Structures are given as C-alpha cells and as structure tokens.
Amino acid sequence: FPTIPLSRLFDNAMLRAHRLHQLAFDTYQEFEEAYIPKEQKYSFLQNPQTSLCFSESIPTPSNREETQQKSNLELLRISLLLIQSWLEPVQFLRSVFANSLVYGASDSNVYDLLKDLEEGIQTLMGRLEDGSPRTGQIFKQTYSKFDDALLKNYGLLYCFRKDMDKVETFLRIVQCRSVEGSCG
Amino acid sequence: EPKFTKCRSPERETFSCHWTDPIQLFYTRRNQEWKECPDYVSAGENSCYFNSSFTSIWIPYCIKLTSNGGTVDEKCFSVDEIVQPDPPIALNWTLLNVSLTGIHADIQVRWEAPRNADIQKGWMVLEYELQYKEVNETKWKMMDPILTTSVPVYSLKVDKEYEVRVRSKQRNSGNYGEFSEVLYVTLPQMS
Amino acid sequence: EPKFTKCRSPERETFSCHWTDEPIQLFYTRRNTQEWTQEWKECPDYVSAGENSCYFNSSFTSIWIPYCIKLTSNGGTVDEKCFSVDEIVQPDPPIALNWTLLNVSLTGIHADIQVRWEAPRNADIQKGWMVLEYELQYKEVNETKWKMMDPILTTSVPVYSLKVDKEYEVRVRSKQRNSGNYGEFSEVLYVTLP
C-alpha cells in the first residue's frame, strides 16, 4: 500500500498548527481590544499565579538556543503534551467563542482541530524515531490539568495563544531538520 | 465486472468512492479487518461516503469492491491522493483597454473559489489554471497556475469571440478538479 | 517626564526598548522566578541600541515569559510596562528587491512583472525559528494611493497589468506569522517598463 511521504505529513501538521495558532491570536486580540485595558493587562501579568498557565507544568524551551538543543522526539513530545492539555480546557472558552466574530472559533471546531493535530503528531513520532532515548521527564509525564470570569476567560485565552505558538514553533524546528528543503 | 470509477475528496475533509453496474464496499485504514461502507446512500447510487469521522489525512486506506462475496476490484490510497477540487465559481471579465490600431484588447478575468474552500479556511490552498481560445478553434491556450482569483488575458482580437474556463487544484497534492462553466468573452467594436 | 516610546524584537532572539528624552535609568524583571516582582535589575546595555535605549541580547531574552520594565528619572519611577518578547516581534525589512519582466501585451499598453526579494538577514527562517509573510505595495509615482497585495508567504510575486508608459514604485514589508508586527518597508524599487 502507499506510505504518506514525511513531507506531506509535516505540511498538513503545519496547516493545522498554524490554523489553531491564528484562531487563538485572532480571538485573543479581539477579546483584549474590547475588554482588557493596558492597566489590567499589566496587573494580570504580574499578579500571583494569574500570568501562570496550567500547561507550564511541562518543561518547554524558552529561547532559540535552548529549543535548538532539543532532539526531534522531545520537540514532538512536548508539542503532543501541549495539544493534549487543551482537549478539555477549550470547553471553557465556549462563551468567548460564541460571541466571537472569528470564523472557525468554536469549542467544537477548535476541539476537532486539536484532535486532528494530535493524530498528526502521533503519526510523526512514529516515523521520526531518531536516536533520542525515550527517557526523561518529558517521556515520563502527562498533559496538564486545569483548575472574576472576565479575567479567567482572559487568562485562558492568553495561555491558549501562547501554547499554540509554542506548538507551531516547535513543529517548524523539527520540519526544517527532517524535511530538507521545506525552509531553505 | 463492476469496477471502481474513482474516489475523490472535494475538500480534504471527507471522500467518497463510486463504481459501475449485489456489490459491496469494504475499507481498512491500514496504518486483516475490513469494515463495510459506513454509508451507501448519501452519495447516491453505487457509492460509499466517508464523512469527516471516517476520513483521516494521516493514514492510508484500502478498499475492495465485493460483488457477491467475491472481490472484483481493490485499491489503496491516501486521502491526499484523491483530492480533486470543485471548479471555481462566478467567472467574470473586465475590459481594460483596446489598442490604438483597434485590433487587440486587454481584459481581466476574475472568479471565486468554490464554496467548500472558504469553509476549509487554512486547510485547502488552491492554485488555478485558466485556459482560453477563439470560439472556432481546436486547441486551448493555457496560462500557468496562479494562486490568485484574477489574472489578465492580453492580445485578444476585437474581431473575435473567445471562451474562458478555469480549474483548480490543491497546491502540489491531488489532481486538477473539473473546469468551470465556460465564460464567453465577446469584444465590442470601439469608435 | 521621559516616557517609553516602544520595545521591539526584530528576530525573536533579542530586543530593545527606547524612551523620550525630556538621571534616567531602566530596571527590568522577568518571570523566570515567581520572586520577580521585586528582584529588579538594571539595563544590561545602555548604549548598543543607540541613544535613549536599552538592549537585551540573547542571554537576557526569553520568549513566552512576562517582562516588567520601569523607567526612573532621578530614582523616581516615571514609567512602567509589561510584555512578552513574542508579543513585541516586528521584523526588519526585506533585502535585494528586484524585478523581471513577465509579459507584454500586443496593445503596447500593459506588461506584467515579477517582483522578488530576500528576507531580513537576521531572521532565522532557515532553521524554522521564524516564519515571515510579506506585504507588497506598489503605485505610479504620481498616484496618491498605494495598491497593496494580500499577504505573500513567499519571496517573489507577480504584480499584473502595469501600464508600460507610466513609472512605478514598489515597497515590501515583513511580519512574523501571527504577531503584531509589520516592520519598516524596504527601500522603494522604481520600475520603468521596457
């Protein structure tokens, strides 16, 4: 039978990651611009916990240098955990999404896209077994669990955008390393 | 023997297979256990429809047409291979300007992506190919694939009627769908 | 009273903040430890990013982590700001803008050109750390308004139906996919059709 070339695998993955990230950004920007003034944004970012996302239980790289030091398997693993951590919490963004003027922004669509991307990363990890010993707190740990509404919605939305950015970014790094020619 | 016509995915989210001519269809998502067609009706006679719940872009499928228990046809493929877009819609054209001689004109052809693309925002890409020719001509003149929904056609002769048709394809995947309705370009005589 | 103008990371690796002149110092803290809201430090480099600025190289820059920054005039706090370096990305402009003729109508009136360029030299698009999209704009040197094309994801693009007699100017600018960027336009390219 035919085997999907790794390149088409990566491209579909990137289409999903990107769409999720774009949806997060657009709804986030939209919420902020209408309900959150700089004042509260600043307060939020320095408030106890608040600026802390549930998904931070997962050790992820924070800069180029560190990201680039991770093996392909770890980067995919990390991205998997990040996706999985949102399968449940998105339900909470339902009210935000219902009032959003963003197409595709719904708890159901967002959930399906997360599920499809999850199958994608799982598919990739099965192909990209490249040295990296399946040992470490990354391979020995699960996704993160979630616990004024406005702020709660705002923090949920602020973290969604951020985690989707990590995913799109992490997958890209692996793409350029594996799929020669997709970047340069 | 009843054989396969084709399987085609219109938007990389679902697909369906059709055959000719008691025929049954069995599939497997060979990442033997065949499961039968989840729907024989939605797509009409001699077809099996696989909605978004049965379609995965990540794994290859295999189907076998079983005429009276016996297998009469078999094929394996990935959804990516059977993608084949719906033709573009709402073809229109604009008159840019006619030369000084009054012999040639420069027009602009415009269209809209098929409705099932706008839905699949970010999932379907699409590059279109426009072809044109004098009504009473045999060959079709072809323009190279573009990602935009507007392109200009230059050097047409005012003293002739032309026809234009365009088809879409997913960016480097699947194959070209079917042509749009032909747009007939008639260039007016200028004073 | 000195105020911050803006901060910016040209390539998601380093960033700098600038303020208006009107002693002034810059103190920052990052959420690299919960006990941060009070463990302030001073601008690691008051010169590199130019006059009235503060520059944070790679060792002082992390993405996805909140940074709080405050400006003091004679020890007194006159301004404060909070952000994430990913939130402040704004790439440099494209390099090597050029154009090739594509088509010429027989009416002698229209020609299609192919405009191409190169991404900012400091953006790491090669190893995937950055992904840019471009906005190309062009117009006749006598038009007040600029025509802008929908976001381009590649480094080349055809603009269609340029009138052969008129002269044109084209500018292009970058943006990290899904950010609040769009840096500065490139140097204007003047197109005089052959």
Cα of A167 to nearest chain B Cα, Å: 17
Percent helix, strand and coil across chain A, each to the nearest 5: 65, 0, 35
Query: Which residues on neighbouring strands pair with residue B141, listed in sequence order?
Result: B132
Cα–chain center distance at A60: 11
CA-based nearest residue to A83, from A54, A121, A47: A121
Among the partner-chain residues B56, B77, B173, the one whose CB lies closest to the CB of A8 is B173
Q: Quick one: which H or E segment has residue A171?
A: helix A149-178
The answer to whether B78 contacts A2, with C-beta atoms less than 8 Å apart, is yes
Cα of B153 to nearest chain C Cα, Å: 9
CB C7 within 8 A of CB C15: yes
CATH class entry, domain B86-186: mainly beta
Determine the Cα–Cα distance for residues A139 and A175; give it in Å rounded to an integer.
21
* Topology adopted by domain B1-85: Immunoglobulin-like (2.60.40)
Domain boundaries, chain A: 1-184
Sheet holding B61-67, edge to edge: B35-36, B23-28, B61-67, B70-77
Interface check A50 vs C, CB under 8 A: no
Q: Quick one: which H or E segment has residue A94?
A: helix A94-98
Domain with CATH 2.60.40.10 in chain C: 1-91, 92-192
Among the partner-chain residues A65, A162, A169, the one whose CB lies closest to the CB of C58 is A65
Determine the residue among C102, C103, C106 to mutate to test chain B binding: the one whose Cβ has the most chain B Cβ atoms within 10 Å: C106
- Half-sphere exposure (Cβ direction) of A158: Cα atoms closer than 13 Å: 26
Among the partner-chain residues B97, B150, B154, the one whose CB lies closest to the CB of C106 is B154
Percent helix, strand and coil across chain C, each to the nearest 5: 5, 50, 45
CA-based nearest residue to B86, from B124, B54, B51, B141: B124
How many residues in chain A?
Answer: 184
Amino acid letter for position C155: T
Residue B153 Cα distances to B146, B161, C165, C166, angstroms: 13, 13, 19, 20
Q: Quick one: which H or E segment has residue A83?
A: helix A72-87
If 0-12 CB within 10 Å is exposed, 13-18 middle and 19+ buried, where does residue C27 land?
Answer: middle
CB pairs below 8 Å between B and C: how many? 39
CA-based nearest residue to B123, from B39, B52, B47: B52
Query: Which residues on neighbouring strands pair with residue B105, listed in sequence order?
Result: B98, B156
Determine the Cα–Cα distance for residues C12 and C92; give it in Å rounded to an integer.
11
Residue C181 Cα distances to A60, C88, C156, angstroms: 24, 7, 20
DSSP letter string over B55-109?
--SSS-EEEEEEETTEEEEEEEE-GGGGB-PPPPEEEEEEEEEE-SSSSEEEEEE
**Start-to-end C-alpha separation, chain B:** 64
Reduce the DSSP state of residue B135 to 3 states and report it: coil
How many residues in chain B?
Answer: 191
Interface check A33 vs C, CB under 8 A: no
For B154, nearest residue in chain C (alpha carbons): C105
CA-based nearest residue to C63, from A100, A161, B71: A161
What's the CATH number for C92-192?
Answer: 2.60.40.10
Cα of C4 to nearest chain A Cα, Å: 14
Domain with CATH 2.60.40.10 in chain B: 1-85, 86-186
Q: What torsion, rounded to 10 degrees, do the Cα atoms C125, C128, C129, C135 define?
A: 40
What's the CATH number for A1-184?
Answer: 1.20.1250.10
The answer to whether C68 contacts A169, with C-beta atoms less than 8 Å apart, is no
The structure tokens listed for B68 are 């009276």
CB B24 within 8 A of CB B66: yes
Domain C1-91 has CATH 2.60.40.10: yes
Q: Quick one: which H or E segment has residue C167?
A: strand C167-176
How many residues in chain C?
Answer: 194
Chains with 3 or more CB pairs closer than 8 angstroms to A? B, C
- Half-sphere exposure (Cβ direction) of C39: Cα atoms closer than 13 Å: 8
Sorted by sequence, the CB contacts under 8 Å of residue C7 that are 6+ apart come out as C15, C16, C17, C18, C69, C81, C83, C88
Determine the Cα–Cα distance for residues A9 and A4; give it in Å rounded to an integer.
7
What does this entry list as its resolution, in Å?
Answer: 2.5
State the pairing for strand pair B161-169/B127-134.
antiparallel
Chains with 3 or more CB pairs closer than 8 angstroms to C? A, B
